[PDB]
Design a protein around this ligand. Structure first.
Ligand SMILES: [K+]
Ligand SMILES: [Mg+2]
Ligand SMILES: [Mg+2]
Ligand code: NA
Ligand code: NA
Ligand code: NA
Ligand code: NA
Ligand SMILES: [Zn+2]
Lengths: 25, 72, 88, 140, 84, 210, 129, 205, 84
RNA sequence: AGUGUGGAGAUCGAAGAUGAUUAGAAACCAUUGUAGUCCACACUGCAAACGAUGACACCCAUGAAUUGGGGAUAUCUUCACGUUUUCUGUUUUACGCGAAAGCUUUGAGGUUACAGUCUCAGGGGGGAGUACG
RNA sequence: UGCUGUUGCUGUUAAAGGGUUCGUAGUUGAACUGUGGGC
């Protein structure tokens, strides 16, 4: 797909991972 | 152009080669102690094991066959 | 003395190429652009003397437009043209 | 010109090959030396002294008439400036720039130019201290 | 694969950094001024058939006094110029 | 060569030879100017016209004669002119000497295609205008043929060897120029010791309207 | 900023020689430049040259006779012993029959054939053939 | 044989009976019979390296043609190469041999150090380039042989060189350009101005 | 033409057009003059490319005028060049 | 573009709303409309941030032009312009080089005939500019 | 295997010039003090 859209997907996943790590810590 | 040519510039050339040598996939694998850690044999040429199951692996296209394999 | 001769005393050169009269460049067989011009000599009476002067130029000079300049300089040195104008 | 910026100009002056003063100059070297001391007393800088001598007196080059340079004469008489002339004019420019900037704080072009003149001062002051034309531990 | 040595605009290797964009005449797309195709057009208000009728019925316009025209400068994007 | 061997000075730009060049305007050149021909340009007059020095123009004329007259077979040499103004000049020039001439549009491949029945392999090739005779000059390079050309002020002096700085744009200018060359070559060969004057008429060389 | 006068001077001659010129102007000059030219003149690779004085680093006008193919400078000036001569000819020279490598020794500036005769080493300066 | 050129007539009339006359005046050769006339039929060996097909896509399919490469030489200082195309592989073979004989070029040979006996090596380092392939030739001492790849070695033997060092770069698997680059390296040996030919050259008519 | 130039001995017309620092040997471009003053009966030496104000004794107003190039001479005076 | 605090709010306009379109329209089209857009101060430090071409210095063929300054010697009004040189910029149109497209006094030239000085990156394609710190 | 390139590599479009500058260690850095004479 579009590399910009793929980068958006990566950013969303990283944000979700950061939130989950903060809540789980 | 892409080089230093000074007479007293041996230190720069030594560090340039040392750093760029890590870009070799072959050279880095030999000089990294993490090598042979993921190798099941542990760096040796042969190994012994116990046969536990028989499997059949299909051939990749454009070839059609069942390759007889064994899980050890 | 032109050519290469071994210490034995035999000339090994199969042939001797011509040399350009402008830049001393060896004329090669594969040129197919170099030219040779013969200029006649005329005696006091006004008639040719039966012989000619030969000069050769390379094909590179012709292909650059500099052949005319070289000829106008070679002919001055050899005496087939007057370098300056007359005096009233 | 070239130290800072993209300028590549070449304007300058070319000195003559023959360093013999012209035969029509009737002034003795004693009068020339006496005349650069008077001008230095007026408060003029060495560069301004040479231009006044050249413009309205016929002395094209002092070194070719008296045999010694203008700053050498002033140093012998103890009238040389406290700090070198080129360093003095650079410090004067930087002082006026900072006075301007304390009122027009959004002038971001003059802040870039101010950075360049102070880098020039540090490179210049480092050279004078090495040749001992400035006191050690001199800071701007 | 470079298609044009000027890259479709009149801006050489490095003499400017940015040029004010303008709107296309038809679609309104924003394009740099030096890249947009620009023409100046002067046109007659009426065609030959209509001009004769108006000139005959007008005590002001005629053989000596000519009729006014419309002068405009038109800048188009590269797509709108080809289609037109 | 203006300077004759042994210092005879027989071949020189006499007074009578001078008026012929100025009468037919063989020194008036085009307002354009090329770097190759800059040496042969003397100065610029009114209306931007450039003038060719007569001395070097005359000097190049004699050299061309010493080359044309040095061939054992006069029929070997070929003279070409694609411009219609030079067709008359090239014809009657060939009549007195014995060279061959061609006019019109140059069929390409004449000097290289061995299959073609019009194969011509001269040792000297002469053209009227280098700009409009590019096909003949270009083909001459591949076969080692020297070229003698009549060059105006603006001229692509490429692959040429002997250049005659003169005018070749006018009817009178072209006809006059071949008269000097035709008159010269016969004198060197020995047909006439002086030929002063000569019963041959310049207007015969002129391209009268057919 | 120009860092080597000799490298700049040798590059001007080679460029002018390739274009088939008759004279070339060299600017600026020095003692090493003039000494290098005298070695080329001794073996007949160039003609007469003139040095013009202008109360600064002067200029040299050199006459070329078409017998020179290429001249160049070696930077940095590596040290050459009496045993290292064989390796230098085999690297930067077209053959073992012609060409010269110029060295600066305690005796002076000379070609490698002369230096080997006097049993001297030095620093490589350039070459010509 | 009916010669169709002035030079061909001279070789037919025995006026020009030496190959160096063509090389001296750089006269182009238009007929292969001139070489056969000027060289004995027993001292001219010809061999063909390889033939590969080339295809052009058409509306209904493809069209295939064959290209052939030929090399000739006397093993004494002459070499020529040629490459022609034809619809039939037999026709391309015939045309290649004619073309090679029209590109005969002299080759200069020299000595490595001591000048005794007969020449055995090229005089100075030379290189030739065609496409991305470049071949460098270096003189070698006596009793070394041809240190070269199998394709360039065959060309060097036909030329008459006995000892040489070679090297290559680029895509050497493209044998169309590898053959053509070796030819330029050898052809360049007569263009170098060594001090043995500095002056005292006389012209001729 | 027909003459080959020499770089060590250039012709007059070639050297007269060159820049002062581009000549074979660089040199000055200026000179000095004698001025009889607008009203003073004295003699003054004035530089050609003078940038500072220059006055007289009996007509001490202005002997020249500064300019981006050669100084502009004040009218009603006498100027003559000097050797060297 | 985005963030914070105070202004301002004409035009346009992410989000949203209502029409069209479409098997379907969340879109392309139409009418609106909030944040934005504008200002001051404080953050952010990224772009097809491109000439996809690091900085300094030398040589180099032809014809165009054009911007700023200076030198010498045909017209107009009561400063502008014409001709030829010159220094600095800024563009168009040969040897040589390149796989080619193409570059070419302002190189991608002067390089297997390989050395002017310094500096930043690359080593088959993905995983991935991802994980851990 | 000049695919680690000191000898000896690539960086417009194939992998790869930093958005632009300033700057310290470091690397590099213009010319000159000199034609010995005679037999
Ligand atoms: K931009
Ligand atoms: Mg709205
Ligand atoms: Mg890329
Ligand atoms: Na819409
Ligand atoms: Na804002
Ligand atoms: Na970036
Ligand atoms: Na190897
Ligand atoms: Zn549009």
């Amino acid at each position: 797909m579009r590399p910009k859209w793929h980068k958006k997907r990566i950013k969303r996943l990283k944000l979700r991972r950061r939130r989950m790590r903060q809540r789980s810590k | 152009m892409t080089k230093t040519n000074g007479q007293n510039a041996a230190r720069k050339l030594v560090r340039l080669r040392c750093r760029n040598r890590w870009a070799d996939k072959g050279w880095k694998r030999a000089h990294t102690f993490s090598a042979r850690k993921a190798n099941p044999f542990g760096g040796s040429s042969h190994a012994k094991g116990i046969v536990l199951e028989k499997i059949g692996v299909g051939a990749k296209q454009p070839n059609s066959a069942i390759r007889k394999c064994v899980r050890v | 003395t032109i050519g290469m001769f071994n210490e034995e005393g035999e000339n090994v050169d199969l042939y001797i190429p011509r040399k350009c009269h402008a830049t001393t460049t060896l004329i090669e067989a594969h040129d197919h652009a170099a030219v040779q011009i013969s200029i006649a000599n005329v005696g006091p009476n006004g008639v040719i003397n039966g012989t000619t002067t030969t000069l050769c130029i390379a094909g590179y000079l012709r292909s650059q437009g500099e052949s005319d300049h070289a000829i106008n300089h070679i002919t001055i040195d050899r005496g087939i043209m007057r370098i300056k104008t007359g005096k009233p | 010109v070239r130290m800072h910026g993209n300028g590549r100009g070449k304007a300058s002056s070319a000195l003559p090959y023959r360093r013999t003063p012209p035969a029509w100059l009737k002034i003795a070297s004693r009068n020339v030396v006496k005349m650069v001391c008077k001008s230095s007393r007026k408060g003029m800088m060495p560069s301004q002294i040479g231009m006044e001598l050249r413009d309205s007196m016929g002395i094209a080059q002092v070194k070719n008439v008296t045999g010694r340079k203008i700053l050498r004469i002033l140093k012998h008489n103890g009238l040389a400036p406290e700090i070198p002339e080129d360093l003095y004019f650079l410090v004067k420019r930087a002082t006026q720039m900072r006075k301007h900037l304390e009122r027009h704080t959004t002038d971001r072009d003059t802040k870039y130019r101010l950075i360049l003149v102070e880098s020039r001062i540090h490179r210049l002051a480092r050279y004078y201290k090495r040749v001992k034309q400035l006191p050690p531990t001199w800071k701007y | 694969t470079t298609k044009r040595r000027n890259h479709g605009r009149s801006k050489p290797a490095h003499s400017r950094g940015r040029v004010k964009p303008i709107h296309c005449f038809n679609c309104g797309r924003l394009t740099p001024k030096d890249k947009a195709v620009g023409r100046f057009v002067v046109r007659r208000m009426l065609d030959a058939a209509s001009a004769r009728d108006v000139a005959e019925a007008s005590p002001v316009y005629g053989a000596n006094f000519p009729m006014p025209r419309l002068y405009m400068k038109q800048r188009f994007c590269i797509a709108c110029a080809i289609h037109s | 060569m203006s300077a004759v061997e042994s210092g005879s000075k027989v071949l020189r730009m006499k007074e009578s030879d001078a008026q012929k060049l100025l009468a037919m305007r063989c020194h008036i050149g085009t307002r354009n100017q090329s770097s190759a021909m800059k040496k042969y340009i003397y100065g610029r007059t009114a209306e931007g016209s450039h003038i060719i020095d007569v001395h070097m123009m005359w000097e190049k004329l004699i050299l061309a004669a010493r080359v044309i007259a040095a061939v054992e077979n006069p029929k070997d040499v070929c003279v070409c002119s694609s411009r219609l103004y030079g067709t008359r000049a090239i014809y009657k020039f060939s009549q007195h000497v014995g060279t061959s001439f061609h006019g019109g549009r140059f069929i390409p491949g004449t000097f290289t295609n061995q299959i073609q029945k019009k194969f011509v392999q001269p040792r000297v090739l002469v053209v009227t205008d280098p700009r409009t005779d590019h096909q003949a000059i270009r083909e001459a390079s591949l076969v080692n043929i020297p070229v003698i050309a009549l060059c105006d002020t603006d001229a692509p002096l490429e692959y040429v060897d002997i250049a005659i700085p003169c005018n070749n744009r006018g009817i009178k200018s072209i006809g006059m120029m071949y008269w000097l060359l035709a008159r010269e070559v016969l004198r060197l060969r020995g047909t006439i010791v002086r030929s002063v004057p000569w019963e041959e008429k310049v207007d015969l060389f002129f391209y009268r309207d057919p | 900023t120009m860092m080597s006068v000799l490298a700049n001077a040798l590059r001007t001659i080679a460029s002018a020689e390739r274009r088939g010129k008759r004279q070339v102007l060299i600017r600026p000059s020095s003692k090493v430049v003039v000494k290098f030219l005298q070695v080329m003149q001794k073996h007949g690779y160039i003609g007469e040259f003139e040095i013009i004085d202008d109360h600064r680093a002067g200029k040299i006008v050199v006459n070329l006779n078409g017998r020179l193919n290429k001249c160049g400078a070696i930077c940095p000036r590596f040290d050459c012993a009496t045993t290292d001569y064989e390796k230098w000819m085999k690297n930067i020279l077209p053959s073992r029959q012609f060409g010269f490598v110029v060295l600066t020794t305690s005796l002076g500036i000379m070609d490698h054939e002369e230096a080997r005769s006097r049993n001297t080493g030095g620093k490589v300066l350039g070459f010509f053939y | 044989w009916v010669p169709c050129t002035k030079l061909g007539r001279l070789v037919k009339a025995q006026k020009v009976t030496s190959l160096e006359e063509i090389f001296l005046f750089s006269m182009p050769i238009k007929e292969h019979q001139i070489v056969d006339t000027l060289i004995a039929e027993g001292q001219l060996h010809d061999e063909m390296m390889k033939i590969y097909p080339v295809q052009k896509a058409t509306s209904a399919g493809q069209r295939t043609r064959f290209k052939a490469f030929n090399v000739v030489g006397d093993c004494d200082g002459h070499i020529g190469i040629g490459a022609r195309v034809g619809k039939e592989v037999s026709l391309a073979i015939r045309a290649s041999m004619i073309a090679a004989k029209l590109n005969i070029v002299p080759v200069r040979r020299g000595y490595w150090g001591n000048k005794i006996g007969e020449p055995h090596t090229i005089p100075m380092k030379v290189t030739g380039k065609c496409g991305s392939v470049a071949v460098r030739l270096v003189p070698a001492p006596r009793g070394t042989g041809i240190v070269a790849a199998p394709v360039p070695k065959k060309i060097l033997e036909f030329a008459g060189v006995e000892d040489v060092y070679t090297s290559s770069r680029g895509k050497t698997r493209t044998h169309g350009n590898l053959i053509m680059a070796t030819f330029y390296a050898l052809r360049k040996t007569y263009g170098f101005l060594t001090p043995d030919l500095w002056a005292d050259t006389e012209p001729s008519r | 033409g027909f003459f080959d130039a020499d770089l060590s001995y250039p012709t007059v017309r070639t050297e007269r057009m060159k820049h002062k620092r581009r000549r074979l040997v660089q040199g000055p471009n200026s000179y000095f003059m004698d001025v009889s003053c607008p009203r003073c009966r004295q003699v003054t030496v004035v530089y050609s490319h003078a940038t500072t104000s220059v006055e007289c004794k009996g007509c001490s107003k202005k002997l020249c005028r500064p300019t981006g190039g050669k100084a502009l001479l004040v009218e009603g005076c006498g100027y003559r060049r000097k050797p060297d």
